[PDB]
Amino acid sequence: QTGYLTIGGQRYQAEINDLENLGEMQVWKMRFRKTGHVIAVKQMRRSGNKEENKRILMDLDVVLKSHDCPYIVQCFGTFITNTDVFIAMELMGTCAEKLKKRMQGPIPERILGKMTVAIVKALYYLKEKHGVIHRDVKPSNILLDERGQIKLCDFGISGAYMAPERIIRADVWSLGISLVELATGQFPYKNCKTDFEVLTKVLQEEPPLLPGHMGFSGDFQSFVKDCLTKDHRKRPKYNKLLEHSFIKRYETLEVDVASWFKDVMAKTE
Template identity: 65%
Template sequence: MRPGSVPCPSPSPSPRSTGSPSPSGSFGIPGSPGSLSMNGPMRRRRDFQLPCSPQAPKPPDGHEIEMKYQEIMKNSGILYLDGAKRPVDINELESLGELGHGTCGHVVKMRHKNTGTDMAVKQMRRTGNKEENKRIIMDMDVVLKSHNCQYIVQCIGTFITSSDVWICMELMSSCLEKLLKRNGGPIPEKILGKVAVATLNALDYLKEAHGVIHRDVKPSNILVDERGRIKLCDFGISGRLVDSKAKTRSAGCAAYMAPERIDPPDPTQPDYDIRADVWSLGISLVELATGVFPYINCKTDFEVLAKVLQEDPPRLPRGQGFSMDFCHFVCQCLTKDYKRRPKYKKLLEHGWIVRYSRLPVNVAQWYARVSERAPLTPTPTPSPLSPHATYLG
């Protein structure tokens, strides 16, 4: 245990959660570390690639990918605008400027000229790269099926041509990575309570409704809008679960990767489950609550991965006013032995989550206050190695 860190406190008794919580504010390595070959400092916005194991299910081949495209193309050019589906010509959209870069492409703010509807459009090139095409298909597949979850960014429609794929999404205002920088310091616990409620419910929905694990939970993939809604995005590297376990080792960010993904018991047969995303949520909460990425002193991929495996997990520091429930929740998320780490259902019953599922918090007011602040110059980044993929803001 590090000096100054808080040991896991006992949780407060909490009633069992019933139903989905109300929305907040009304609202994309086999072996041990010794087998790694990683030279040079980690760059920001870099995804850490994990090779697929030899015995993992084969990714879709070119024909299968094309068949999926053809299936999705049946609704290409149909957008959900003003409460109704309508055919839209791609030339009816005008660009209002780039918003950022995601896992598979870049995101542009666009407006439908006839209705004045603004949207975020993720634009991706169709290439001969099977892995890239698989990520595009996965991203589209998840968002198109998640229209009934208030905690996942909503898809308005798609445009698919022989060379490009556009995914039209509802326009959010910013991501937590950028808000942390603009805030110039830690994000209040009451806001993080709503962030955790929204993220947990989104992850639980993906698992229960679609058998999907996100695999890239981090502050840049959690979005906020001016109405105070908090939503999860970027499903390019999500994975299908087989018997509740992930059978491939596709990709992710080393900075938020769970120990069992870095050094699995059997590298040839990865079988981590949704609790890998629970770890990523815990790391994200520590970063947002303290304003500093937990492994900030690491300069290389190897260092951060080695620290995750060899050191005690991060904890919320003492003397900063965090509630005992919040400290315990983070301890639960950052349990190194994933077999002892709680799954979504158990965490949704945690006292801290139950409290913020019910407690009114004006996230919209907090967002307005933070968004009006000029960014600090120079801006202290949460982590020099944190490979966030910028989305919006």
């Protein structure tokens, strides 16, 4: 399980000295000198915070168990030393939040469609085969790379965007809030100065749905409306969401997410 890098089928026996630290992104960007592959490495120090190390080990436990899920960041191997644990994760491009910051505007629906089917299937995978509820769905946990892949981040994968009943299917509400934010470039609770004020607007105000003057398809507006159901007893589970016309459309439609991602990253900071 340890002392081996598995980068695309091939397994390599290696140690931490076989990796060149290319800087920080504690998550390091490191290069495998034997092959030239550039990977992400998380360093968990033995003397580190017990609360932080507990979350890292619990998240790693789910990641190692989720090798058969294509919509979850995978582990390439581990290196255990006397003072550190190095966790090799696949190097993703950037999170959806930084994509929103670099875009300085709305994200196209065709990108959010491929994003929706990837995150729902990831959440559905965590609950059915592992009984895991993410309990923290947000654009910062949605990772996209230069190859068009969309995967769930490993941070907090073992369990502002909080559902009404949380203040089971509460991650459905957080997904709907994330979709509205990315589709409009505006967080629907951006003028709230405190966390408690956000919770009040979630319960008191009507759910913030997609605008009808941005060319959004009826399937997109319907999927978001279903995700943002106030009553959790009437909010659809993942089995019902996977049968939505919005999901079925982007399960098969060829969307060039890779080229769109490269153009957004090519935009200057």
